[PDB]
Design an enzyme around this catalytic site. Structure first.
Site, PDB file in Angstrom:
ATOM      1  N   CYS A  91     -84.320   4.107  11.351  1.00 18.03           N
ATOM      2  CA  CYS A  91     -83.485   4.750  10.745  1.00 18.03           C
ATOM      3  C   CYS A  91     -82.115   4.930  11.361  1.00 18.03           C
ATOM      4  O   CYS A  91     -82.129   5.613  12.525  1.00 18.03           O
ATOM      5  CB  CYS A  91     -83.984   6.033  10.203  1.00 18.03           C
ATOM      6  SG  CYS A  91     -82.793   6.560   9.010  1.00 18.03           S
ATOM      7  N   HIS A 133     -87.097   3.223   1.850  1.00 17.48           N
ATOM      8  CA  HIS A 133     -86.365   3.844   2.921  1.00 17.48           C
ATOM      9  C   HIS A 133     -85.116   4.492   2.568  1.00 17.48           C
ATOM     10  O   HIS A 133     -84.687   5.826   2.627  1.00 17.48           O
ATOM     11  CB  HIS A 133     -86.493   3.346   4.263  1.00 17.48           C
ATOM     12  CG  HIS A 133     -85.708   4.035   5.356  1.00 17.48           C
ATOM     13  ND1 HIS A 133     -86.543   4.346   6.303  1.00 17.48           N
ATOM     14  CD2 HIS A 133     -84.491   4.414   5.839  1.00 17.48           C
ATOM     15  CE1 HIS A 133     -85.692   5.145   7.184  1.00 17.48           C
ATOM     16  NE2 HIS A 133     -84.530   5.303   6.715  1.00 17.48           N
ATOM     17  N   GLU A 134     -84.205   3.649   1.746  1.00 13.64           N
ATOM     18  CA  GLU A 134     -82.822   3.729   1.561  1.00 13.64           C
ATOM     19  C   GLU A 134     -82.849   4.611   0.228  1.00 13.64           C
ATOM     20  O   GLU A 134     -81.718   5.288  -0.150  1.00 13.64           O
ATOM     21  CB  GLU A 134     -82.161   2.563   1.300  1.00 13.64           C
ATOM     22  CG  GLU A 134     -82.126   1.771   2.694  1.00 13.64           C
ATOM     23  CD  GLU A 134     -81.330   2.595   3.704  1.00 13.64           C
ATOM     24  OE1 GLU A 134     -81.831   2.603   4.886  1.00 13.64           O
ATOM     25  OE2 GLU A 134     -80.169   2.950   3.557  1.00 13.64           O
ATOM     26  N   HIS A 137     -83.032   8.166   1.083  1.00 18.25           N
ATOM     27  CA  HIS A 137     -81.611   8.706   1.278  1.00 18.25           C
ATOM     28  C   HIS A 137     -80.864   9.249   0.137  1.00 18.25           C
ATOM     29  O   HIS A 137     -80.095  10.182   0.339  1.00 18.25           O
ATOM     30  CB  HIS A 137     -80.508   7.723   2.152  1.00 18.25           C
ATOM     31  CG  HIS A 137     -81.130   7.382   3.648  1.00 18.25           C
ATOM     32  ND1 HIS A 137     -81.401   8.448   4.283  1.00 18.25           N
ATOM     33  CD2 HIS A 137     -81.455   6.298   4.246  1.00 18.25           C
ATOM     34  CE1 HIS A 137     -81.427   7.940   5.609  1.00 18.25           C
ATOM     35  NE2 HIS A 137     -81.858   6.754   5.801  1.00 18.25           N
TER      36      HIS A 137
HETATM   37 ZN   LIG Z   1     -82.343   5.583   7.213  1.00 15.93          ZN
HETATM   38 ZN   LIG Z   2     -80.099   3.153   6.038  1.00 20.25          ZN
END
Ligand SMILES: [Zn+2]
Ligand SMILES: [Zn+2]
Ligand SMILES: [Zn+2]
Ligand SMILES: [Zn+2]
Ligand SMILES: [Zn+2]
Length: 180
Positions: A91, A133-134, A137
């Site tokens: 990350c 993963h994103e 965020h």
């Molecule tokens: Zn990340």
């Molecule tokens: Zn990222």
């Protein structure tokens, strides 16, 4: 211009739906893509470059002049696969930190494109891992929130150093603390 690093509270703040689709959304998405290729990613979400908006740029090949440039606004993961797989996640907000996260192997996603229209997409393999993963965020969730307590233990000290760097850089209390 910048990648936001943990423990910056930008990476935890609410991200605002996008209702306006203009020259500005376009020029910000190009900036995001170019940071993505700069840093060799497959995906980049807006909070990571310091804007709290529900915007993600994606290239499933994650290299220039390959793949497709996909822009996902207000995306929603409808479905997660039932098969889970372990993968060594990194990350950009935690420079140099990699560790096992187990996640769903595939997903399906509704979102909106650059002019405003809705599309959906199914993802698998590396693209799905990176998209999840994103996406996290966008929802103010960081990869260590996904690690087992065993695996987090291995990176706790490296996260504490990022905490301390934040307190050094900006003379205030790390707003979040892995010791929690
Ligand atoms: Zn990340
Ligand atoms: Zn990222
Ligand atoms: Zn570009
Ligand atoms: Zn590459
Ligand atoms: Zn400690």
């Amino acid at each position: 211009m910048e990648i936001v690093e943990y423990p910056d509270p930008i990476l935890r703040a609410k991200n605002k739906r996008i209702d306006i689709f203009d020259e500005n959304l376009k020029n910000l998405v190009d900036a995001m893509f170019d940071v993505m290729y700069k840093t060799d990613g497959i995906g980049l979400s807006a909070p990571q470059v310091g804007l709290n908006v529900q915007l993600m740029v994606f290239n499933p090949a994650g290299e220039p002049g390959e793949g497709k440039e996909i822009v996902l606004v207000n995306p929603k993961i409808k479905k997660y696969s039932d098969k889970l797989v372990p993968f060594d996640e990194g990350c950009l907000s935690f420079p140099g930190i990699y560790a096992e996260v187990v996640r769903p192997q595939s997903v399906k996603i509704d979102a909106r494109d650059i002019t405003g229209e809705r599309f959906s997409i199914s993802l698998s393999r590396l693209p799905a891992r990176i998209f999840q993963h994103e996406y996290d965020h966008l929802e103010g969730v960081l990869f260590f929130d996904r690690m087992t307590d065993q695996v987090l233990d291995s990176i706790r000290e490296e996260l504490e150093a990022l905490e301390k760097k934040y307190e050094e850089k900006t003379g205030l209390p790390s707003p979040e603390r892995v010791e929690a």
